[PDB]
Amino acid sequence: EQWVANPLKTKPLAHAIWDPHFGQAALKAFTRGDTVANISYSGVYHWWYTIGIRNNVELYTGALGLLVLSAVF
Amino acid sequence: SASYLPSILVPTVGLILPFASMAILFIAIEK
């Protein structure tokens, strides 16, 4: 939703990192906000933004809504 | 945002899950 606020400017983040191998100098090469997450190169925010998800809350209800469906299958 | 959960879940799936999965699968050669 920070990306929804500024779609051209902000680079869209993927999941965060937990490397215990990043000593210090790599940890300053990822800081996009407080997380050090990867830039998401998969177009998923664009599809979820044309869908009309403008929240993180709707993504939680969707993620639960597909844990339910995966448990159904 | 629980900022502590990857500190538990990343190592326990990254290294210790391919310990017990080596035990379950590799002994499951004989089970």
Binding site: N56, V57, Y60, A63, L64, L67, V68, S70, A71 | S1, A2, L5
Partner: peptide, 27 residues
Amino acid sequence: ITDNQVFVALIMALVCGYLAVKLAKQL
């Protein structure tokens, strides 16, 4: 962005994990 919803998610995929291992040792 919150805390307890993450726990709800890991419980639901713990149940989904038990259904996966429930599918595993029958086929």
